[PDB]
């Protein structure tokens, strides 16, 4: 510190001699020793740890620096003035968009609308802390992602889910960000940032068919993100920029969320046990798009679970039969149909885990939960047709086949509909055996299918579920008969004996049967034409090897700069198909063949969000298999060059931190499938039976071994960068697993990993100043 002060005084005196003179190379040499001392990382670290013990000499340092800067800036040089500016910046030293927030928001919109907001707030705060993001640009990227995903949404229920996601889930996210962190000024700044983007907002307004920025600003006013004066001048600006009969979906959703709450509170009590009122309200629900609007609002606002509990309890109430005549039981069976079909539609759209009760004290699990558990096809669920669930009795099933062969029921006055729906599988099994032996004619098959599908539509769904399981098990030539059964069960309407609301139940049932049969009718080219409703389904090309799909989608995502919704779905199917290791390895290969700084940083900011499909398993593969294979192989580390290598080290440390601090249904199923012994994989010469701690301990042993060895190459630069962004990215812990020999070795190989880690007590300077020695 004193020699730096003497050097500053030498530059001041030599520059004064230069001013009096006007070869004065003394200034050139003085500045050369300034930049040669201060250019080293050792010396600037030594001055920074020298700062603490000698306070107020730094003031004299900077005042001499200011006078030096004046006397040099008056007499500029073609080379020395730039040098003096550089040394001044050194002594003081002692954007673009943010694609990751974009793709995280678009991922949560596409995959789990029904996820809790706290997980999303935790993930977004994480991303804001990893790469240090200003708050206006952060909220701007949230709004831009939401609007872009709304515009790119396919028409149908996905447009409803995206309108509910922007207008109902994102304000709650910003509210919890306001809690968990001067937010109104920043969100107002971000709204002005957004209101500059007139083409985005006009594309959105053409899809919304209204001013959806007006509804946004009134909604953020209601939540309290924005002050009212801000809201009014923003709406004035938007109207001025805008100047150059059916309700739109946003008004329907924003008014339909209070109807979700009030429909909960009024149908707690079965309309004071008036089932005709229930029939009227539920018939209004099955009128076009009203169910979807309620479900999108309830999903975006966290109340889908209570909605499912309410319809399940209604179903349990209408399972059995009260003592009745005909026009009370013909109401009760319709209540069973409406509750069942809406529950199947919920379970097929928003996943099955909102239907589960998650704790049932006592054995009294409802009928629909067990039926969905053991009998309904989902995406990753294939069913055993001769599971014991599909073989309840032999007693009831003969009563049921006699019931279906009697006439049009007429005995609906007491049916115990759960028993009937559980027995249809065995019933149509015996019907199929009878038709395969030929004892039954095709015309009687038509009569039985009409008796099934006519009075109550849920029977067709239960039968088609068992038929789909049974056709999936069969061979190719043996299928031909059973597909005809689906053609009659899923055919157009049987008429003239319908109870009530028949066409709407037919419409919902045709959707459910589409999503049940689609896979089996993909295996053999069979068109049923039930009635787009499956917008992201069957996305892969039929014959092309799957790495070409992966590299093409990643090339297009890099050249755009953000991840689409369709690209998110194909990336999910490839992660499920080729497995985690293949996926993560091929994406990292496609990283490492980039040569530009800009494209490498963008690729990493996208790949973090792509790996957020299953972050935990991807981190285990990444820090356990990919990085030790790149660091240990002697031929591989030429790929660890400067431009891709810094980016890869950033991605590894972001993945490590986000996995430590701590998501799709395929990934949940597959990690429940997975068996591995991480104690055996990483023998290692907190818990330490948690595999991530084991991978991190193994990786830090590898890093210490690389830093300690001879033959410094690009891999040593890699582990330097990894430790430096471990230091910079942290708040304070991933570095709890670092071996203490790394503390010594890292400043043997050079710096910041000392000067940050020490926490700067008076004794802490002594250990700091000791470390900065050797090299």
């Amino acid at each position: 510190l004193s020699a730096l002060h003497w050097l500053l005084r030498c530059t001041a005196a030599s520059a004064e001699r230069l001013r009096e003179g006007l070869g004065e190379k003394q200034l050139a040499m003085c500045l050369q020793r300034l930049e040669k001392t201060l250019s080293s990382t050792k010396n600037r670290a030594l001055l920074h740890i020298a700062k603490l013990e000698e306070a107020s000499s730094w003031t004299a340092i900077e005042h001499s620096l200011l006078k030096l800067g004046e006397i040099l800036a008056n007499l500029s040089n073609p080379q020395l003035r730039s040098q003096a500016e550089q040394c001044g910046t050194l002594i003081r030293s002692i954007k673009t968009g943010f694609p990751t927030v974009h793709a995280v928001i678009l991922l949560e919109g596409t995959m789990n609308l029904t996820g809790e907001t706290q997980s999303l707030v935790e993930q977004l705060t994480m991303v804001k802390r990893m790469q240090h993001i200003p708050t206006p640009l952060f909220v701007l990227e949230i709004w831009k992602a939401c609007f872009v995903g709304l515009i790119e949404s396919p028409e149908g229920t996905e447009e409803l889910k995206w309108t509910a996601f922007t207008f109902l889930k994102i304000p709650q996210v910003l509210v919890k960000l306001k809690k968990y962190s001067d937010f109104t000024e920043d969100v107002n700044c971000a709204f002005e940032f957004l209101l500059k983007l007139t083409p985005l907002l006009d594309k959105a307004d053409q899809r919304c068919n209204c001013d959806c920025t007006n509804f946004l600003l009134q909604e953020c006013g209601k939540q309290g993100l924005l002050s009212e004066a801000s809201v009014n001048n923003l709406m004035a600006k938007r109207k001025a920029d805008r100047e150059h009969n059916i309700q739109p979906n946003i008004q329907l959703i924003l008014r339909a969320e209070p109807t979700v709450t009030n429909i909960l509170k009024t149908m707690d009590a079965d309309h004071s046990k008036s089932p005709e009122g229930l029939l009227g309200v539920l018939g209004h629900m099955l009128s076009g798009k009203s169910l979807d609007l309620l479900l999108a609002a309830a999903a975006a606002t966290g109340k889908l679970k209570s909605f499912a509990r309410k319809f399940i309890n209604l179903n349990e109430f209408t399972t059995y039969g009260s003592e009745e005549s005909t026009k009370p039981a013909s109401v009760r069976a319709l209540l069973f149909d409406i509750s069942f079909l809406m529950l199947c539609h919920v379970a097929q759209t928003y996943g099955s885990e909102v239907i589960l009760s998650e704790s049932r004290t006592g054995a009294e699990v409802p009928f629909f939960e067990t039926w969905m558990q053991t009998c309904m096809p989902e995406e990753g669920k294939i069913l055993n047709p001769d599971h014991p669930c599909f073989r309840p009795d032999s007693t009831k099933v003969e009563s049921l086949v006699a019931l279906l062969n009697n006439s049009s029921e007429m005995k609906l006055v007491q049916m115990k509909w759960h028993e009937a729906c559980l027995s249809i599988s065995a019933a149509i099994l015996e019907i199929l055996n009878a038709w395969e032996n030929g004892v039954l004619a095709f015309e009687s098959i038509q009569k039985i299918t009409d008796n099934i599908k006519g009075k109550v539509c849920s029977l067709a769904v239960c039968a088609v579920a068992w038929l789909v399981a049974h056709v999936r098990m069969l061979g190719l030539d043996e299928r031909e008969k059973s597909l005809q059964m689906i053609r009659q069960l899923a055919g157009p309407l049987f008429s003239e004996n319908t109870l009530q609301f028949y066409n709407e139940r037919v419409v919902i049932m045709n959707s459910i049967l589409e999503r049940m049969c689609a896979d089996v009718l993909q295996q053999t080219a069979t068109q049923i034409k039930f009635p787009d409703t499956m917008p992201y389904w069957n996305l892969l090309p039929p014959k092309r090897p799957i790495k070409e799909v992966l590299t093409d989608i990643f090339a297009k995502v890099l050249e755009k700069g953000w991840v689409d919704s369709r690209s998110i779905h194909i990336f999910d199917t490839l992660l499920h198909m080729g497995g985690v290791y293949w996926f993560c390895n091929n994406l990292i290969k496609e990283l490492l063949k980039e040569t530009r700084k800009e494209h490498t940083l963008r690729a990493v900011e996208l790949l973090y969000s792509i790996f957020c499909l299953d972050m935990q398993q991807v981190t285990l593969v990444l820090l356990g298999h990919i990085l030790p294979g790149l660091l240990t192989d002697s031929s591989k580390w030429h790929s660890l060059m400067d431009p891709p290598g810094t980016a890869l080290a950033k991605l590894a440390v972001w993945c490590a931190l986000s996995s430590y601090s701590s998501a799709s249904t395929r990934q949940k199923k597959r990690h429940r499938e997975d068996i591995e012994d991480y104690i055996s994989l990483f023998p290692l010469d907190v818990n330490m039976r948690d595999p991530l701690n084991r991978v991190l301990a193994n990786l830090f042993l590898l890093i210490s071994s690389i830093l300690g060895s001879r033959t410094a190459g690009p891999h040593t630069q890699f582990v330097q960068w990894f430790m430096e962004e471990c230091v910079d990215c942290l708040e304070q812990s991933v570095l709890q697993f670092m071996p203490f020999t790394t503390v010594s070795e890292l400043v043997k190989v050079s710096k910041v990993v000392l000067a940050i880690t020490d926490l700067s007590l008076p004794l802490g300077r002594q250990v700091a100043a000791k470390a900065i020695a050797a090299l």
């Binding site: 071994s705 300690g708 060895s709 070795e745 043997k748 020695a773 050797a774 090299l775």
Partner: protein, 115 residues
């Protein structure tokens, strides 16, 4: 930790040398690094002479990690470097640590008597 043969060789040195371990560079993973000294009526020019004694001492004779940065900028130091390097070249294979210390001392003495 440190092999017994190195401990005995250290215990049986001439009091001119004050050998010690090296905690500065990356050690305790490969060879044993030593900065010893030169203390005698002779000259104490460049006391460290960092020596890396590998494991399995009765083989792979230890190598002196060269540091020409300090031995330059001075004629005496350049001369001692030249003569000690030539004397290491003339040293027989499988030399010991005491051999390097003695040839270092005698090379310094030769540089004294020459100039």
């Amino acid at each position: 930790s440190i092999p017994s043969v190195l401990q005995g060789e250290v215990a049986r040195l001439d009091p001119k040398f004050l050998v010690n371990l090296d905690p500065s560079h990356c050690s305790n993973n490969g060879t044993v690094h030593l900065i010893c000294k030169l203390d005698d009526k002779d000259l104490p020019s460049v006391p460290p002479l960092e020596l890396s004694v590998p494991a399995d001492y009765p083989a792979q004779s230890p190598l002196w990690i060269d540091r020409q940065w300090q031995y330059d900028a001075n004629p005496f130091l350049q001369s001692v470097h030249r003569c000690m390097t030539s004397r290491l070249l003339q040293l027989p294979d499988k030399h010991s640590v005491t051999a390097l210390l003695n040839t270092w001392a005698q090379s310094v003495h030769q540089a004294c008597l020459s100039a």
